[PDB]
Amino acid sequence: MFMINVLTLIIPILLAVAFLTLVERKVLGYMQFRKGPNVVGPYGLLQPIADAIKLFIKEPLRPATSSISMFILAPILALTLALTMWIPLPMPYPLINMNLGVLFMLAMSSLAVYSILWSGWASNSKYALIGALRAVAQTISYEVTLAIILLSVLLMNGSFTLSTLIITQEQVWLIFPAWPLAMMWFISTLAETNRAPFDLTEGESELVSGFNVEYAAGPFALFFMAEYANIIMMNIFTTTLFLGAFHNPYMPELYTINFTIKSLLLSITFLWIRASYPRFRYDQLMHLLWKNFLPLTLALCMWHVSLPILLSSIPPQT
Amino acid sequence: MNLMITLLTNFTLATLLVTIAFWLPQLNVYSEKTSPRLPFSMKFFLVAITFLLFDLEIALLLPLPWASQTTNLNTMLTMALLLIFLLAVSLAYEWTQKGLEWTE
Amino acid sequence: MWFEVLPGIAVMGVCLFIPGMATARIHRFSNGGREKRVAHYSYQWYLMERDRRVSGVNRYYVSKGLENID
Amino acid sequence: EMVRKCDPHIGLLHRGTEKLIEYKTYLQALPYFDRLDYVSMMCNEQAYSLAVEKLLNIQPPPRAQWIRVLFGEITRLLNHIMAVTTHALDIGAMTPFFWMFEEREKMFEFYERVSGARMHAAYVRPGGVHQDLPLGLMDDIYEFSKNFSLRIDELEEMLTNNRIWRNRTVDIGVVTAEDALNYGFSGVMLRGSGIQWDLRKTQPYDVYDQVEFDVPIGSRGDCYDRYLCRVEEMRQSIRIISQCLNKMPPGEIKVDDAKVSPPKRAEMKTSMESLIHHFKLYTEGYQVPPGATYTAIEAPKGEFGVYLVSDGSSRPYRCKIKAPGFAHLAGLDKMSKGHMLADVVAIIGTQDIVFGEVDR
Amino acid sequence: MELLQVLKRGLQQVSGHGGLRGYLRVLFRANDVRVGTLVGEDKYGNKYYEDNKQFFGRHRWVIYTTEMNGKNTFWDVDGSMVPPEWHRWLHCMTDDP
Amino acid sequence: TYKYVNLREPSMDMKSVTDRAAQTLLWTELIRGLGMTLSYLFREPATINYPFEKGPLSPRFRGEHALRRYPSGEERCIACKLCEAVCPAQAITIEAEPRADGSRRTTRYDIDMTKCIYCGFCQEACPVDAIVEGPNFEFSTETHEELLYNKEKLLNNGDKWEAEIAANIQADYLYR
Amino acid sequence: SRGEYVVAKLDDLINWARRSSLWPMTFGLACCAVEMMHMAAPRYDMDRFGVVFRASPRQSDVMIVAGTLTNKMAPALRKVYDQMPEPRYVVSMGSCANGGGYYHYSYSVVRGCDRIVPVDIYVPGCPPTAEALLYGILQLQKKIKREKRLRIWYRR
Amino acid sequence: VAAFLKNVWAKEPVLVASFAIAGLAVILPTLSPYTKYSLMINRATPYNYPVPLRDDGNMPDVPSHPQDPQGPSLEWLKRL
Ligand SMILES: CCCCCCCCCCCCCCCCCC(=O)OC[C@H](COP(=O)([O-])OCC[N+](C)(C)C)OC(=O)CCCCCCCCCCCCCCCCC
Ligand SMILES: CCCCCCCCCCCCCCCCCC(=O)OC[C@H](COP(=O)(O)OCCN)OC(=O)CCCCCCCCCCCCCCCCC
Ligand SMILES: CCCCCCCCCCCCCCCCCC(=O)OC[C@H](COP(=O)(O)OCCN)OC(=O)CCCCCCCCCCCCCCCCC
Ligand SMILES: CCCCCCCCCCCCCCCCCC(=O)OC[C@H](COP(=O)(O)OCCN)OC(=O)CCCCCCCCCCCCCCCCC
Ligand SMILES: CCCCCCCCCCCCCCCCCC(=O)OC[C@H](COP(=O)(O)OCCN)OC(=O)CCCCCCCCCCCCCCCCC
Ligand SMILES: CCCCCCCCCCC1=C(C)C(=O)C(OC)=C(OC)C1=O
Ligand code: SF4
Ligand code: SF4
Ligand code: SF4
Secondary structure, three states: OHHHHHHHHHHHHHHHHHHHHHHHHHHHHHHOOOOOOOOOOHHHOOHHHHHHHHHHOOOOOOOOOOOHHHHHHHHHHHHHHHHHOOOOOOOOOOOOOOOOHHHHHHHHHHOOHHHHHHHHHHOOOHHHHHHHHHHHHHHHHHHHHHHHHHHHHHOOOOOOOOOHHHHHOOOOOOOOOOHHHHHHHHHHHHHHOOOOOOOOOOOOOOOOOOOOOOOOOOOHHHHHHHHHHHHHHHHHHHHHHHOOOOOEOOEHHHHHHHHHHHHHHHHHHHHHHHOOOOOOOHHHHHHHHHHHHHHHHHHHHHHHHHHHHHHOOOOOOO | OHHHHHHHHHHHHHHHHHHHHHHHHHOOOOOOOOOOOOOOOHHHHHHHHHHHHHHHHHHHHOOHHHHOOOOOHHHHHHHHHHHHHHHHHHHHHHHHOOOOOOOO | OHHHOHHHHHHHHHHHHHHHHHHHHHHHHOOOOOOOOOOOOHHHHHHHHHHHHHOOOOOOOOOOOHHHOO | OEOOOOOOOOOOOOOOHHHHHHHOOHHHHHHHOOOOOOOOHHHHHHHHHHHHHHHHOOOOOHHHHHHHHHHHHHHHHHHHHHHHHHHHHHHOOOHHHHHHHHHHHHHHHHHHHHHOOOOOOOOEEOOEEOOOOOOOHHHHHHHHHHHHHHHHHHHHHHHOOOHHHHHHHOOOOOOOHHHHHHOOOOOHHHHOOOOOOOHHHHOOOOOOOOOOOOEEEOOOOOHHHHHHHHHHHHHHHHHHHHHHHHOOOOOOOEOOOOOOOOOOHHHHOOOHHHHHHHHHHHOOOOOOOOEEEEEEEEEOOEEEEEEEEEOOOOOEEEEEEEOHHHHHHHHHHHHOOOOEHHHHHHHHHHOOOOHHHHHO | OOHHHHHHHHHHHHHHOOHHHHHHHHHHHOOOOOOOEEEEEOOOOOEEEEOOOOOOOOOEEEEOOOEEOOEEOOOOOOHHHOOHHHHHHHOOOOOOO | OEEEOOOOOOOOOHHHHHHHHHHHHHOHHHHHHHHHHHHHHOOOOOOOOOOOOOOOOOOOOOOOEEEOEOOOOOEOOOOOOHHHHHOOOOOEEEEEEEOOOOOEEEEEEEEEOOOOOOOOHHHHHOOOOOEEEOOOOOOOEOOHHHHEEOHHHHHHHHHHHHHHHHHHHHHHHHHO | OHHHHHHHHHHHHHHHHHHOOOOEEEEEOOOHHHHHHHHOOOOOOHHHHOOOOOOOHHHOOEEEEEOOOEOOOHHHHHHHHHOOOOOOEEEEEOHHHHHOHHHOOOOOEOOOHHHOOOOOEEEOOOOOOHHHHHHHHHHHHHHHHOOOHHHHHHOO | OHHHHHHHHHHOHHHHHHHHHHHHHHHOOOOOOOHHHHHHHHOOOOOOOOOOOOOOOOOOOOOOOOOOOOOOOOHHHHHO
């Protein structure tokens, strides 16, 4: 009975990741004054299926790898972490109700850079490794503000428990006391998943994404679907964290409908940010972290430490 | 226990997807293709070390939502603002001595 | 026009609705028509194990009220 | 991170265009010029037409000159759309590309209505243009120009005040005015460095001394002022197109020297002299008196020159094609020093580079 | 409310193809279900439609026949299935069918 | 007769400084750009339904070549070789002899469509409207030699497309 | 029999998947790049056919050779072709990629890219219009639709 | 000090907001009248068991029953 619940978590994750590619190509189509796919299925609904079947019967590209073991383990680790980030998410009930779900998700997302690092090791090109080290330095840079913004918000929650964060936001959305934390959170999660305007691997400002370079890389579909699982998950986590919905304990479907609509709007906001801006240069998003976001994050961290003490609004532990 | 079952299930589904994505495109026999240190940067290593040290400072900051529940609140607030201030002082020394340069 | 993106958004929304609705219905099926007991703290687990021992069927979710006392 | 030396290796689209010109007549060598700066087709046509007309000692009729200036500014709108949108798409902004190529699609429809080809029209010819405007074309050019300002406005809404676009272009590719003069730069590569120079003003050709436009001048020599100069040149191209649509004269569209331009097909089939002249223009071609000219126009990429040498025959002897992208890409190595590898693609965007005219 | 007018226009598009069968027929062959004024039909079965309220480019269209010169063109429709007398009208070289 | 793009010194009073600081801290131009992208989300897209809808063309369009006839069936080409004399690609190859009734006609009329630059100089050089360049652009092949047209292919294109070619010449011959 | 039916329906499935998810790599060498960029522009819009614009060259299906192939970029063309995962197709766009074009007699131009790579669809024009290139892409899709990989596998 | 403040608010407003938020976080809990109640609420939250006292005979302030009048009260917390 529990394995049924695990599978009804993880298989609709993969189906939602499949149709996020359709939603991306359509919404980026209409924002670019064109259409997205509408030929392959009715209104494009067979495009993820056709594209997945195409990617699964396509040849392994040309080259060989430096390390077979890490070439195998990097997509395994990427997909495993991308699936385990969903199990403490209270929607309205988490699959694995743990006392430290926030800290669990922060730790498992900190583990996600090893897939990038091991895919940089496993490629033969010494330039793809440099691109991987740039990506690792980017992701570990924005994990700092993820941790401190998350701590500053949890000072109004009382615990690391994700299910308590529904109870915390019963009177107001938590974006009202913490909107600067919320906007730096949203941009930092955008910079976490290598998502535009922070996608330097998939774009220019890159020493190796330069057309007729070497570097045996993994099967693209696995890292791609791990990345879109991470995108939907970080938007659901932002929805739980700042825009927490009404929960009737006798009707859980009201909360599920409400957080689902908000998470869809927030993922479409990712789609609408990537179709609106040019890319940062690498030192420009290093600037944006280290000289812009981190001073405000430390200042608001001091503020959200000292603020429940001065307002007599310290939340309960339980 | 249910956590271990879930981790094993996620690891199994991931390994199954990886094994399919490596062995399913080997079904179609293809034409066998017969034709035909990295430079160091100090700034790349320095941003990683700056990450590590600020991450240890964050590791000090993580018990704050439990630390606000104490009865010694004046000492707690002093040491909380002092850890965030020492993180800010580490950032200011990293700023002013040209440490955040060309990866700013 | 722009309502052509709504079938894909609707399918993705149903796919996000399935996990939460699924875990709520499975928690109510596995726990006697009620919410799953949350035991974050060892007192909550102590009361839950006491319920499991007083229910007589090795199930914490079989509630015994005043009909169990004389 | 830094770029110490940037060596562009070119000739990967070198086709030996100006050797193939030497074995063809002047009318036959005209469609090579559509294919040089292939986002600037009728401007290069106009440059070669002015070179051959300067050697032939003839002039186009006034209506042909107004058609050339109208379609030269339509061509300038085409090229600055291509410039700004690919310069944004390489930096990363992908959406105004798709927005402005629908307007660029409508201007290719203008080319197809006037010539039959959407790009390589072979329309502006030595002597004038090939064929007259079809009826109702100027009304649709009016309907395009009446709305195109809003298109430039929303492009400029997406990019100009954007902090991410400005952080990629404001301190990037600074060229001093003296180095821009010394390195053979031309057009926006001069005018972004504050050099008040434009060949439509200083050395004016067909009827550019009769239209009325402003010339945008930069102040810092960077990628961002050259972006603003190209956007304001699209604004001023809309202004010139409004003046060309209002001041179009009646009359013929070829020079009425039938020893240079072909007679009409109605009189080719009726008159003996007209049939002889049609025969000898489409087989031998017109002879050009011996001499060498350097005719240069203000193309949308800069000074586009033709050093054309005639030997008295009906084929060019030498035809050197001066192009802006050659000198700009030569200056790429200076413009990228002390910058990063991401700044190099912004510098190849601010130098509007098309390798057909770089390579010939 | 003007959303009701949109839904009634959608339902009369369903009705204007002769019910759900013709609606799904044009939805899967054309990927486009809008209704138009039948300008004519050639000797192959290609049907040609107008809607001058559409923008220029959409306002004239063809529904291709299912069998032209022996080939099953139910799914294998082709741009060159249009005969030359309708090729001027469909490509808007004239206002005249 | 010139204007200065980007020669604006910003106001340094507290109102404008607070305006620019609010733009920095509250991302106002970024929300402007999001609003412009959202504005295009709710427009009707410019996408035509190819192949069921076709892009607009004029009667001057230069597509596939065709050899024409008089309204008797007699072919118009009288072998004068002006079209290969003017052909800037030398895509046209012509041989000729007097045919069996003594008429000046071609035996070879080749057009390599993969040399051809589709510039229509052959149709404007032709004194008898024989070679024209029709409206067909949907003639992609699967092999290279299917685009090396001989006289029979061009006469079949003429017989195939004459009902349209004659109407386009009828619309455009007064400009020529 | 039964196995012929099964391999026929599996050919139909994999041909549907491969033609309806074409990912093009574009050699935008010359003027035909401009017209492919119009084939991806909102009017014609290759992306609604499943044909994504600016796909990765590492995981592309069809190599659209759009421009003049010179002698100096013929080995780079062949190198990018050799780095493509099978099934790979090649659409030759325009007269210079088809047969040398306007530069056929040049000292520096490969007379058609079919001297270098195998070509599946030849799209004629200088340039062919964006509609003509989309015609060639749909003809490539029809060519994939009638492939018989598993039927010929079963009959060998 | 008014020229420097407007200059740093024109050039580096992120740092000005940073130092302003940090300075408010430092000097504000010593000025707030509710900082007393944070201490009062944390010391009134009963984590442990209230281990009772042996009634020796002289403890007039200690109640004998939870609902007795004498003892520590939380009416200030119900009302606030
Ligand atoms: C959760 C749902 C979503 C939440 C909202 C997010 C949706 C909107 C997203 C828009 C698109 C963003 C795309 C990525 C943009 C990245 C670039 C960017 O914005 O860089 C940030 C820019 C970076 O600066 P910059 O580069 O623009 O400016 C130049 C910077 N220097 C000078 C250093 C060179 O600004 C910030 O860092 C601001 C961060 C958040 C600010 C929070 C303000 C708090 C204000 C408190 C009061 C202040 C008043 C004074 C004190 C009063 C005390 C009482
Ligand atoms: C949580 C929700 C998840 C939802 C996931 C799915 C989203 C999309 C839903 C489907 C939308 C409609 C799909 C229609 C596909 C095309 C059907 C069809 O008729 O195709 C025609 C094709 C050939 O037919 P033919 O015999 O040639 O017809 C000639 C007529 N004279 O005929 C064929 O090819 C044969 C029939 C094929 C039918 C395919 C139908 C779609 C299958 C998708 C797989 C998933 C199914 C759902 C699983 C989850 C729900 C239970
Ligand atoms: C390259 C190698 C392969 C890579 C892919 C696979 C590995 C990587 C992805 C898996 C990572 C596993 C992380 C699991 C532990 C996370 C922490 C944790 O257990 O938190 C949940 C919870 C804490 O909450 P709390 O409520 O306080 O405790 C329950 C008491 N009421 O605590 C509990 O519920 C406790 C439950 C019992 C203890 C669980 C122990 C799990 C098994 C041992 C570790 C397995 C992973 C080892 C490898 C890691 C990566 C190298
Ligand atoms: C013993 C019997 C079984 C034997 C083994 C076969 C197993 C079942 C395999 C699927 C069905 C086989 C047939 C596949 C389609 C064949 C028919 C076809 O291609 O019809 C064409 C039609 C669209 O026509 P088209 O040519 O595209 O025209 C352009 C638009 N005018 O196309 C359409 O209308 C759409 C076609 C959709 C194809 C089916 C749906 C996708 C496949 C779903 C199942 C497999 C994938 C499962 C999920 C994977 C992960 C996402
Ligand atoms: C007292 C409470 C506790 C205070 C400590 C806690 C602080 C929390 C925030 C953490 C900040 C971490 C980083 C700090 C670095 C400071 C040094 C610095 O940034 O100097 C450089 C800067 C000029 O920037 P530049 O180097 O040019 O940057 C490249 C782009 N131009 O130089 C400047 O812009 C000038 C910087 C100094 C002047 C800032 C004045 C702000 C005043 C705000 C109102 C008063 C607030 C109370 C605090 C006292 C401030 C004097
Ligand atoms: C399991 C389901 C697999 C679906 C795979 C879909 C992959 C995405 C298709 C389109 C696409 C997008 C949106 C995309 O963003 C991208 O990166 C730039 C691509 O690679 C070049 C793409 O091909
Ligand atoms: S269109 Fe031009 S290149 Fe083609 S055959 Fe005619 S004259 Fe020659
Ligand atoms: S110009 Fe006309 S008549 Fe003369 S050879 Fe050519 S096609 Fe024939
Ligand atoms: S076939 Fe012609 S128009 Fe096309 S790229 Fe070549 S030269 Fe340019």
